[PDB]
Design a protein around this nucleic acid. Structure first.
Lengths: 72, 110, 66, 93
RNA sequence: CGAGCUGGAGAUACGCUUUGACUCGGGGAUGUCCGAAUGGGGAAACCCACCUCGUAAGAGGUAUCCGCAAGGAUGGGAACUCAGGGAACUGAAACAUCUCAGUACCUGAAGGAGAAGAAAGAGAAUUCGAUUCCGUUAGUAGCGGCGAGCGAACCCGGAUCAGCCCAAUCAAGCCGAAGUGGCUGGAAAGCUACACCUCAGAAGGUGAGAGUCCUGUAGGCGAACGAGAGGUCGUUGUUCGUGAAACGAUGACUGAAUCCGCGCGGACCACCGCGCAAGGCUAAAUACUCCCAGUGACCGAUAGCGCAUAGUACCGUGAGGG
RNA sequence: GUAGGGGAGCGUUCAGUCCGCGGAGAAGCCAUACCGGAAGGAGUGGUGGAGCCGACUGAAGUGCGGAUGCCGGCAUGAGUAACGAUAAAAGAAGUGAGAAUCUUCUUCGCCGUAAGGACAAGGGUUCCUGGGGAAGGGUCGUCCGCCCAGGGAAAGUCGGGACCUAAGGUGAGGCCGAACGGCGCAGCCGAUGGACAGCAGGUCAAGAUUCCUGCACCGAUCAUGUGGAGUGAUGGAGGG
């Protein structure tokens, strides 16, 4: 989970073969199709007073700059 | 087991009035009501009677014989009468006891 | 028994009107299990009474302060 | 009050026999700790209590009826007055 | 309400009642111990403490989270709603694709209903103009190991129909018309002979088949007081399984403008055209059904619910079955 | 004439309609040498004790011998095999409607590191007394661990709790996590372990280091005297 917005939870991952032919080979057969999840990280921050909490790149970046309710 | 509600636990009469027993045996026979059992539609008018034999086992010197006693009835007796014959009821009002209401048929008493 | 001639009494008298009925009620109950309870009903009454004995007293609990 | 809690007197023969020696015993209430009970009694019969014994008693009966039965749980308690023998006369019974 | 009551049970004793019980409507007060349970402990209903009020008895407070502060939250709900997670069998007469399905199941949140909602839309007539639901369009367009098979939307008809705001009568209940004789019978409401009522001849009960005996019905009354952004990579949704495949959506990286501005109209460009996203709340029609009433070319006891009642006996360590 | 196709009908229930039927007696049941081409129908008699035929039409949980079918009843096997350790019994007496099978007495035999006694767990009232006699007791039963009713269980010191901790369980702040949730210091719960004040007798039909009797011990609170001064922690050590 991040500061601004939650995260994690992701989606499936395919894997095709015969991949790419004359502008188009015969086609792209699939052989995978499963399922996955994507995470991030943290750095200590705080508002009101001292904290720590997780901080998502795409937030520690947005916070590194203009702060929004939260201070780096 | 349903029971005596078909009517409506309402006795069309008092455990004190006088009534003639229409239909069934004891037709036209009358007598002062005694038991007013509404729920069940039970009536004890000095009319019907049976001589029962009491079951008094180790009941202090048994000597149990055959008691004459009244047997209850249902809506089988048409409540109260004045013309000396079964009579509906209808023209109520009140008395010097406006705190109440009466009943009456062709005539008007009870 | 409930009419004003009930409330008509004090707060302690109320108590007095209670702690005694269950002093009767007791001897009664004793009698019972001791054999001789000829006054089954008496019990009920006695009981009944103490209910009101409080029921009423509770009625004051909102009447005189709200 | 005082008169509360005691539930009834213990009839039986022994008990009654125990009485001929100044030991009284009635059924108190289940949850009726020794002290309270020791109290009650005294002040309901005017007298003190030198000793007190108490312990619980289940019940589970019936006559018939696919209704088995059910306990009824009691708590017969026994007290020993001081040389100041007797409780009223609800003893001489 | 008006003269019985004293629960199922029916049995006896004591009694209570017109100084209006009983019973029925509707507010109160009592409401032990457990259970969110929450003074602490705990193998549920048990064990132990503390502060305060207090003549003893006895009363009250003592959990955690938001909040100055009131005040709110923790649990429980048959199905219905959305959300996070999400199978296999099965089909493809084998199977990896796909199908079965985003169903079954798990969890979260919630209400009586939800959800969705006021156009960076759909869509082509330079039209319609929130959302939802029904019919239809149409099994058409399309997707598809282009196999098995899956399958829209616009238009049109109908239910219901609002957009507004930010930030710079039903329950209790009371009244209610109109028949007698003879006959068959153990008993008649049946037969029969003359009689009446009928805005009430719906129904149930009466010792057999009942308009006129009872309870009722049509119809009338009826209460203190109670309700009503763009992109690159990984992927995905919509008919969309990479295909030339847009747009939406997002984990990751990046990263704009602002009217001679911005987005889109299935790559893509110009032209023409529709709309203005990154703030929000919102009846109504919709779904279900624990409960209630009425009905039923529904059952009538091996049926019907598992139960004419019982989730009981009984089986299991238990989940559970019954 | 088998699979299969085609035709016409019989019967059950429910439903709308017509004619009706019934307590001097309906449905169902039971009997029968009638009728019809079959499915089937009728008459008469018996039982029965209240709803019910026939006709047209509509709808159907609509027709059965089979599924090692399902529920239930009842058979065969057959007064068969069994009566659950080869520790044996006999007599007298008694009670009783009735006893090989109950009680009494006198002998016999079997266990005797047990087939005796005392706990724990576990089960509950199965304990004791008076009754009972259906069903249970592999037979009898006058009896019972079975049915009924009543009584019975007594603790400052025995076990446990108001003390302790182990494993392990839980756990404010804390560490992780799609949800649910997963871990985690202190603190807490947790014996099976530590700690800790009685013992000798008597005795209900039925209780006992609990009641009684004799004598004793522990803590707690207050009174009195003695004293004549510190007392001494959620911390230290020692120790357990």
């Amino acid at each position: 989970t991040g500061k601004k917005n939650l995260v994690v939870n992701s989606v499936i991952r395919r894997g095709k073969a015969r991949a790419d032919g004359g502008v188009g080979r015969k086609t792209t057969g699939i052989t995978k199709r499963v399922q996955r999840a994507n995470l991030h990280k943290k750095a200590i921050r705080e508002n009101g007073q001292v904290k720590t909490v997780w901080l998502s790149a795409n937030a520690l970046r947005t916070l590194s700059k203009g702060p929004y309710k939260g201070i780096e | 087991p349903s029971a005596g509600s078909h009517h409506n636990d309402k006795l069309h009469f008092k455990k004190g009035d006088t009534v003639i027993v229409l239909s069934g045996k004891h037709k036209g026979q009358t007598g002062k009501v005694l038991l007013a059992l509404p729920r069940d539609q039970k009536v004890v008018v000095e009319g019907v009677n049976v001589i029962t034999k009491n079951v008094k086992p180790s009941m202090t010197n048994p000597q149990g014989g055959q008691e004459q006693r009244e047997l209850a009835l249902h809506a089988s007796k048409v409540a109260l009468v004045d013309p000396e014959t079964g009579k509906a009821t209808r023209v109520r009002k009140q008395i010097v006891d406006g705190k109440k209401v009466r009943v009456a048929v062709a005539s008007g008493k009870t | 028994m409930k009419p004003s001639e009930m409330r008509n009494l004090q707060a302690t008298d109320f108590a007095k009107e209670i702690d005694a009925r269950k002093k009767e009620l007791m001897e009664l109950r004793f009698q019972a299990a001791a054999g001789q309870l000829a006054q089954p009903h008496r019990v009920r009454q006695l009981r009944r009474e103490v209910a009101q004995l409080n029921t009423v007293k509770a009625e004051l609990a909102r009447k005189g302060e709200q | 009050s005082h008169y509360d809690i005691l539930q009834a007197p213990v009839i039986s023969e022994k008990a009654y026999s125990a009485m001929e020696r100044g030991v009284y015993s009635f059924w108190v209430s289940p949850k009726a700790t020794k002290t309270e009970i020791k109290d009650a009694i005294q002040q309901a019969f005017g007298v003190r209590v030198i000793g007190i014994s108490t312990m619980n008693v289940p019940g589970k009966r019936k006559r018939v009826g696919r209704f088995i039965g059910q306990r009824n749980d009691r708590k017969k308690a026994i007290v020993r007055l001081a040389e100041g023998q007797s409780i009223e006369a609800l003893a001489g019974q």
